[PDB]
């Protein structure tokens, strides 16, 4: 058998320096394919907004220290990339991904039953 | 056991051909014979007794 397009073999990285390079390479691939994401998924936003969204997700995991968490985060980030480029995700899922987003006071929540 | 219900559409298809042939053979032959009777309408349509 052969792997699908844009598939990477799973490997457990044991070097933080080597892990950092692999993350930066993948981050570039997300930016390069940003215009492809707008084309395939027929998004209503420019590719510039897509690249901004990509950076935010990479900035969330900027300060993760543990190496085992880095590998699982990296592996899951590769799977998502292979999913987007190959057009396996349905267009509704990608549209809702950009649909994501001031908290009320104590009394405001108290009046409506709070959470 | 001959299924007569299955043979009904073939009977209508058979009558489809017979409709075309029955009309074409008679309508065309009559018109050719009618127009061969004479040089005007009073001879083509009317039939003399003699």
């Amino acid at each position: 058998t052969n792997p699908t397009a844009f598939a990477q073999t799973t490997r457990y990285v044991k070097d933080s320096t080597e892990m950092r390079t692999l993350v930066l390479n993948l981050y570039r691939r997300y930016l390069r394919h940003s215009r492809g994401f707008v084309n395939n998924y027929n998004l209503d936003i420019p590719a510039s907004q897509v690249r901004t969204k990509i950076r935010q997700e990479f900035e969330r995991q900027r300060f993760v220290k543990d190496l085992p968490l880095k590998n699982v985060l990296y592996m899951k980030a590769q799977m998502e990339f292979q999913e987007l480029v190959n057009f396996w995700k349905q267009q509704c899922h990608v549209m809702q991904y950009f649909e994501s987003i001031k908290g009320d006071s104590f009394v405001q929540k108290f009046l409506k039953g709070a959470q | 056991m001959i299924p007569f219900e299955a043979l009904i559409p073939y009977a209508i298809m058979f009558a489809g051909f017979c409709l075309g042939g029955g009309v074409m053979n008679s309508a065309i032959t009559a018109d050719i014979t009618k127009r061969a009777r004479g040089p005007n309408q009073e001879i083509k349509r009317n039939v003399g007794e003699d």
Binding site: - | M1, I2, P3, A6
Partner: protein, 55 residues
């Protein structure tokens, strides 16, 4: 060279579609048998006392 049929025997079954014509004949036999269809809702398929339906 180790076949049991002559060249003309195998070519006659081949060119004249021997087994294809047999399959047509088997199909034509079914044309003269009683069909299985029942006329729902005027007729109902068999049911058993163990049947599970509306509560």
């Amino acid at each position: 060279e180790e076949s049991s049929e002559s060249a003309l025997s195998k070519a006659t079954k081949w060119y004249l579609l021997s087994e294809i014509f047999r399959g047509l004949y088997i199909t034509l036999e079914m044309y003269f048998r009683a069909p299985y269809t029942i006329y729902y809702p005027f007729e109902k398929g068999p049911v058993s006392p163990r049947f599970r339906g509306e509560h």
